[PDB]
Amino acid sequence: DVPPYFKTEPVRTQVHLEGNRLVLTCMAEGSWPLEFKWLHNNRELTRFSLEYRYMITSLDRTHAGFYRCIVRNRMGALLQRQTEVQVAYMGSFEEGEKRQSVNHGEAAVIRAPRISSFPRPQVTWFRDGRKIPPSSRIAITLENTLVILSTVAPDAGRYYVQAVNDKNGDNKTSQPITLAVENVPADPIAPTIIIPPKNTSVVAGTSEVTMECVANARPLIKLHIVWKKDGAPLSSGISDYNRRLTIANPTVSDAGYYECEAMLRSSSVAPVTRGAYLSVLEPPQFVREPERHITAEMEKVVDIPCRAKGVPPPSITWYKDAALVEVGKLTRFKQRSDGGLQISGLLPDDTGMLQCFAHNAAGEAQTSTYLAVT
Amino acid sequence: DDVPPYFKTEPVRTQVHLEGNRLVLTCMAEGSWPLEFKWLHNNRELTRFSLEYRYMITSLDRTHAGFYRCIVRNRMGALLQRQTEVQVAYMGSFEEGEKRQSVNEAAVIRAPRISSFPRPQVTWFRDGRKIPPSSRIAITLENTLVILSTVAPDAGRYYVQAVNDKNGDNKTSQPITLAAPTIIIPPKNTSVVAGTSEVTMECVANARPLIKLHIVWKKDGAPLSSGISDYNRRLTIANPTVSDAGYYECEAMLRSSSVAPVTRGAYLSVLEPPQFVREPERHITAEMEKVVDIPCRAKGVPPPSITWYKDAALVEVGKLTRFKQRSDGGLQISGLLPDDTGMLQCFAHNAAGEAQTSTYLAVTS
Ligand SMILES: *[C@@H]1O[C@H](CO[C@@H]2O[C@@H](C)[C@@H](O)[C@@H](O)[C@@H]2O)[C@@H](O[C@@H]2O[C@H](CO)[C@@H](O)[C@H](O)[C@H]2NC(C)=O)[C@H](O)[C@H]1NC(C)=O
Ligand SMILES: *[C@@H]1O[C@H](CO[C@@H]2O[C@@H](C)[C@@H](O)[C@@H](O)[C@@H]2O)[C@@H](O[C@@H]2O[C@H](CO)[C@@H](O)[C@H](O)[C@H]2NC(C)=O)[C@H](O)[C@H]1NC(C)=O
Ligand SMILES: *[C@@H]1O[C@H](CO)[C@@H](O[C@@H]2O[C@H](CO)[C@@H](O)[C@H](O)[C@H]2NC(C)=O)[C@H](O)[C@H]1NC(C)=O
């Protein structure tokens, strides 16, 4: 007569190839009969049974999503930590041949043709069978967009993409995009920001996070890009002709407003500044947890603690036997600001498994306890 | 036409895959043509240099498990990819047959040897009935069954049902027939990386009468009242940090009589993978016959060793007349020759993992 508990919990995220087999397991121990139910995106896949496995013999892209199990017995029920199954795939290039025009000196922006893939494929740009590497005048953005900084007469022509998926090794080629250059002498062009920094969120402890800013000017040689954090100039982590700002091992202290300032050296031209926010996140970690086993007298009031910390601050949710606790309607159940649950006028029907889930955009945490009402 | 090679992405440090599934490793590098790739399994050559950036395994086997890494090269030089550990989930059959053991005292029955990755979850059975951990029944992390105070009805055949949590395999072994404070299962040395959610020390003690037996947990001589579970046999630290490292002791005593306590301890090491403090610039230029200093420092627990490679080849510090490695980990090349031009790679390695930084060395004139 021992309440359920998980011997192991599944990983938060999983990447699998299409056509491969997937085996989900609900590894719990406890008194018989220990039965299991499976959920996909908070929707029931199966009924309660002695089958602790959920198996997909041939994985498809549509099978991607969140899976979790519920284990139960005569004592109560527990919700498994949910796992994200991601299916590696790559479709074909959707768009056909396209046409685009740019003025002489101004920047040509050619977006990579839309193709469905997970993860986003690595892109190599080609013109007439020749690779186009990043250079002083040619930039390739994180969105795999091709940017010609100072367009000239010979820049006109057909550009196409070779995209490769790094998980399944799929390699596909897109349709050509014809770029034309209009009004071909040469006069000074003011510095402008083509690809401004976008809002970027990343979890603490990742290997790298990158901000990006592509600027244009004529002459391009006079163009200089300055990176700032909260108004202060940054001198480290800058690469790719001052268009990339890379932070290795980002911390919550590295969060803030990052600005890209494009200027012309040896000139009186005023700079152009465009910025975005970097958010560094930390998953929930518990500060206060309930005891493994909680015993309490009938008709009395019990305080069950649950506090957690994270960036952003984690929301705290309670479950009673794998079912959501309604603190709104029930007079007996009250939720304290720290996240603790208070049950007043304890009835024998409150006996069972209580679970606390602390959730934030960076992840989820779970702690459980058995409430026995004497 | 003159771009040194570089990696657009790096592979995950560890990946678990099922037997019979297909695995596709990719060497995602960019650079000037011809960009060729070579594959290595446990630092042994799998392929020759070719335009195939993929290594594909149609049907994964247990023998395919190990460390894989690629080398990318072109006219500019070569780079070593960060190695990835491919682990193949499987479970064989129970090898050993029926065994017999006798005890007068505690009965210690090891779980039957079965080949499996990962280690399977084990449920012990007696005569078709599950035997959960109790005041007198302990189950260790190595899945060894320990009956503390054996009695007449304790005798009989015990067997294990083992389940692999990755492929869902479930197998049953052959029966094993079984017919003063001491420490049976002492705390073992445990190393773990920070952020593993949990790490557990274990100590199983035996005494008659068992009710008077008491286990106290200590860290560096100081008693702990938290993280203790399973009848004081388990000490669990949630979200271990480098501060949690140190000597943990299990002390078993009797709350009566003059019998001396028994103490057994082990070391807990919390490790952090290498992270670079100082890195070389993307491109380093230097004059012929002169000396160049290329910096490389990194931190980790334990302190990471630092090794240099030149174009995916180990730098011979044995013949260190021109090449010297400073104690800080920096590389110095004296009497610079035009043949020193190319990709230099600095690998910072620790037991918790490895990190890599690269640079292009151009020797003028
Ligand atoms: C990019 O996001 C910002 C908001 O950033 C938030 O606030 C920061 C202080 C930091 O904590 C970030 O992690 C947050 O996500 C948008 O800027 C404005 O934000 C304020 C609140 O801070 C909001 O009231 C305004 O409405 C936001 N501006 C607009 C136009 O709605 C900014 O707009 C975002 N960028 C884009 C392109 O949408
Ligand atoms: C467990 O390991 C210790 C040594 O641990 C190492 O040193 C610690 C200071 C710490 O840095 C750990 O991370 C290291 O792994 C073993 O201690 C040895 O004990 C024997 C006798 O028992 C003695 O002869 C040796 O000199 C000791 N070695 C050291 C380095 O002190 C201990 O034996 C290990 N436990 C078991 C059960 O083998
Ligand atoms: C992706 O596949 C394409 C072909 O589908 C490869 O491109 C070929 O490369 C050879 C080698 O010189 C050329 O002879 C062919 O003409 C190319 N085909 C096309 C359609 O251009 C390409 O190499 C593959 N990707 C990688 C990274 O190797």
Residue numbers in the entry:
A (entry chain A): 3 to 186, 189 to 378
B (entry chain B): 2 to 105, 108 to 182, 194 to 379
What does the original paper state about this entry?
Sdk1 and Sdk2 are single-pass transmembrane proteins, with extracellular regions composed of 6 N-terminal immunoglobulin (Ig) domains followed by 13 fibronectin type III (FNIII) domains, and a relatively short intracellular domain terminating in a Postsynaptic density/Discs Large/ZO-1 (PDZ) binding motif. Here, we report the crystal structures of cell-cell adhesive homophilic dimers of mouse Sdk1 and Sdk2, each mediated by the four N-terminal Ig domains. These four domains adopt a horseshoe conformation, like many other IgSF cell-cell recognition proteins, but they interact in a unique back-to-back anti-parallel manner not previously observed. Overall, our data suggest a model in which Sdks form cis dimers on isolated cell surfaces, which dissociate to form trans dimers through the same interface when contact is made to a cell surface expressing the cognate Sdk.
Two crystal forms of Sdk1Ig1–4 were determined at 2.2 and 3.2 Å resolution respectively, one of Sdk1Ig1–5 at 3.5 Å, two of Sdk2Ig1–4 at 2.7 and 3.2 Å respectively, and one of the Sdk2Ig1–2/Sdk1Ig3–4 chimera at 2.7 Å resolution. The second panel shows protomers from the two Sdk2Ig1–4 crystal forms structurally aligned, and the third panel shows a single protomer from the Sdk2Ig1–2/ Sdk1Ig3–4 structure. The dimer protomers are related by crystallographic 2-fold symmetry in both of the Sdk1Ig1–4 structures, and by non-crystallographic symmetry in all the other structures. Although the Ig1–2:Ig1–2 interaction is present in all of the crystal forms of Sdk1 and Sdk2, there is a difference in rotational angle between the two horseshoes of the dimer among the crystal forms, with the Ig1–2:Ig1–2 interface acting as the hinge. This results in differing levels of interaction between the Ig3–4 regions in the Sdk1 and Sdk2 dimers in the different crystal forms. The Ig3–4:Ig3–4 interaction varies from the Ig3–4 domains forming a considerable additional interface—as in Sdk1Ig1–4 crystal form 2 (915 Å2 BSA) and Sdk2Ig1–4 crystal form 1 (1294 Å2 BSA)—to being splayed 14 Å apart, as in the Sdk1Ig1–4 crystal form 1 structure (0 Å2 BSA). These differences indicate that there is flexibility in the interaction between the horseshoes in solution, with different conformations being trapped in the crystals. In addition to these major interfacial regions, the Sdk1Ig1–4 crystal form 2 also shows a small contact region between Ig1 residues E11 and R83 and Ig3 residue E212 towards the center of the horseshoe dimer. This interaction is not seen in either of the Sdk2 structures, although the residues are conserved.
